[PDB]
Swiss-Prot record:
One of its GO terms (cellular component) is cytoplasm. InterPro entries: Pept_tRNA_hydro, Pept_tRNA_hydro_CS, Pept_tRNA_hydro_sf. Monomer. Its main location: cytoplasm. Keywords: Cytoplasm, Hydrolase, RNA-binding, tRNA-binding. The lineage of its organism: Bacteria, Pseudomonadati, Pseudomonadota, Gammaproteobacteria, Pseudomonadales. TRNA binds at residues 17, 68, 70, 116. It is found in: Cytoplasm. The record marks 95 as: Stabilizes the basic form of H active site to accept a proton. This is Peptidyl-tRNA hydrolase. Its EC number is 3.1.1.29. CDD domains: PTH (cd00462). The active site is at residue 22.
């Protein structure tokens, strides 16, 4: 029932991190900005790249933080604070170790499950975990001590292709996500195959 007003794509900024797995969220927002003809504006007020398009009478902002991943909440609280967007109207796209490339999934609430962008966003929003997440499969290196080197790696072509297919599946339920119809978005999405 709650229209989306902020879509956030997590990533690390800088050529050092560009095209790495940990930036799947920002790739999604970047694709979304492009399809919607939206320009992403370097806005130091929000410590990120900001854009907007109109949907159903409301402005939908797109945010790609330019702080480090671990300080993402600062970007998301700035923009969401200035505009008084509640967590319920926020969607955060992020890399998800727990699903393979090719798989995208939606979730409402829950933990950060170890993702330090999500953890910061949760802390900065006065401890509310209630925002929505678009989980973009990036696979798992199989061990916990490789995680950090893995998210920061660039995936081989086959996995990069499958990430791109799951971002295309996700854009397919954009009408549903923008409306806050999570049940349907989940239904159409979680029925695709890469």
């Amino acid at each position: 029932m709650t229209a989306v007003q902020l879509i956030v794509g997590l990533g690390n900024p800088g050529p050092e991190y560009d095209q790495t797995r940990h930036n799947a969220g920002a790739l999604f927002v970047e694709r979304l900005a492009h399809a919607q003809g939206v320009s992403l504006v370097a806005d130091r007020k929000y410590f990120g790249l900001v854009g907007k398009f109109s949907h159903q009478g409301k402005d939908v902002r797109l945010l790609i933080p330019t702080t480090y991943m671990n300080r993402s909440g600062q970007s998301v609280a700035a923009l969401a604070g200035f505009f008084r967007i509640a967590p319920d109207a926020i969607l955060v796209a992020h890399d998800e170790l727990d699903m393979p490339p090719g798989v995208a999934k939606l979730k409402t609430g829950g933990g950060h499950g170890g993702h330090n962008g999500l953890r910061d966003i949760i802390a900065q929003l006065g401890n509310q975990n209630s925002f929505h997440r678009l989980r973009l499969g990036i696979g798992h290196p199989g061990h916990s001590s490789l995680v950090s080197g893995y998210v920061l790696g660039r995936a081989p072509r086959s996995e990069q292709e499958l990430l791109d297919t799951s971002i295309d599946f996700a854009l397919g339920v954009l009408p549903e996500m923008l409306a806050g119809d999570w049940t349907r978005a989940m239904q159409k999405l979680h029925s695709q195959k890469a």
